[PDB]
Amino acid sequence: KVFGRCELAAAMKRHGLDNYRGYSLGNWVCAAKFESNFNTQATNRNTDGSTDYGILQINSRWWCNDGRTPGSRNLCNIPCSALLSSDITASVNCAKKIVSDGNGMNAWVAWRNRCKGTDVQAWIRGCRL
Numbered sequence: 001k002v003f004g005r006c007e008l009a010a011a012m013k014r015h016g017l018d019n020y021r022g023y024s025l026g027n028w029v030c031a032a033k034f035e036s037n038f039n040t041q042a043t044n045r046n047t048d049g050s051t052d053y054g055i056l057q058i059n060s061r062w063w064c065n066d067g068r069t070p071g072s073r074n075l076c077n078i079p080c081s082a083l084l085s086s087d088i089t090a091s092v093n094c095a096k097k098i099v100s101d102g103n104g105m106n107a108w109v110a111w112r113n114r115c116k117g118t119d120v121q122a123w124i125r126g127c128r129l
């Protein structure tokens with residue numbers, strides 16, 4: 001599924017991300033924009049052989065199992081395929097684990113390089129939430 005901007009903002013809020021670990025909703029919407037262009041089915045293979053999955057491009061080296069990332073962990077205890085669903089529950093629940101683990105949203109390189117420090121409220125401006 002490709003979410004609209006305000007549609008994703010609302011879904012993320014319903015799933016408890018607004019101000020989760022102190023990160024306002026706009027941070028999460030911005031991260032999703034630049035990670036996946038709001039496409040739940042986004043995948044991208046990394047040079048180390050791991051793969052990023054879903055609307056927040058969660059990586060198989062640590063967070064999910066795809067059976068093809070040698071030496072990796074599955075800290076969210078889910079198949080990576082679960083991160084591709086039109087329903088964002090699995091991605092959100094895993095993202096909550098990730099952002100709680102010490103480095104906050106810096107875990108998402110695109111957030112750090114493109115959202116951090118910017119007017120992220122713009123991503124939710126005008127939306128019914």
Ligand SMILES: [Cl-]
Binds near residue numbers: 003004005006
């Ligand atoms: Cl949009």
Ligand SMILES: [Cl-]
Binds near residue numbers: 005
């Ligand atoms: Cl947009």
Ligand SMILES: [Cl-]
Binds near residue numbers: 025120121124
């Ligand atoms: Cl915001």
Ligand SMILES: [Cl-]
Binds near residue numbers: 065066067068071072
């Ligand atoms: Cl594996």
Ligand SMILES: [Cl-]
Binds near residue numbers: 068
């Ligand atoms: Cl393969």
Ligand SMILES: [Cl-]
Binds near residue numbers: 072075
């Ligand atoms: Cl594990």
Ligand SMILES: [Cl-]
Binds near residue numbers: 065066078079080
């Ligand atoms: Cl699995």
Ligand SMILES: [Cl-]
Binds near residue numbers: 021022103105
């Ligand atoms: Cl933080």
Ligand SMILES: [Cl-]
Binds near residue numbers: 114115118
């Ligand atoms: Cl930007």
Ligand code: NA
Binds near residue numbers: 063065067073
């Ligand atoms: Na894994």
Ligand SMILES: [Re]
Binds near residue numbers: 011014015087088089
């Ligand atoms: Re939902």
Ligand SMILES: [Re]
């Ligand atoms: Re719903």
Ligand SMILES: [Re]
Binds near residue numbers: 018025
């Ligand atoms: Re909010």
Ligand SMILES: [Re]
Binds near residue numbers: 035057110
């Ligand atoms: Re990415």
Ligand SMILES: [Re]
Binds near residue numbers: 059
């Ligand atoms: Re990534």
Ligand SMILES: [Re]
Binds near residue numbers: 048
């Ligand atoms: Re690896």
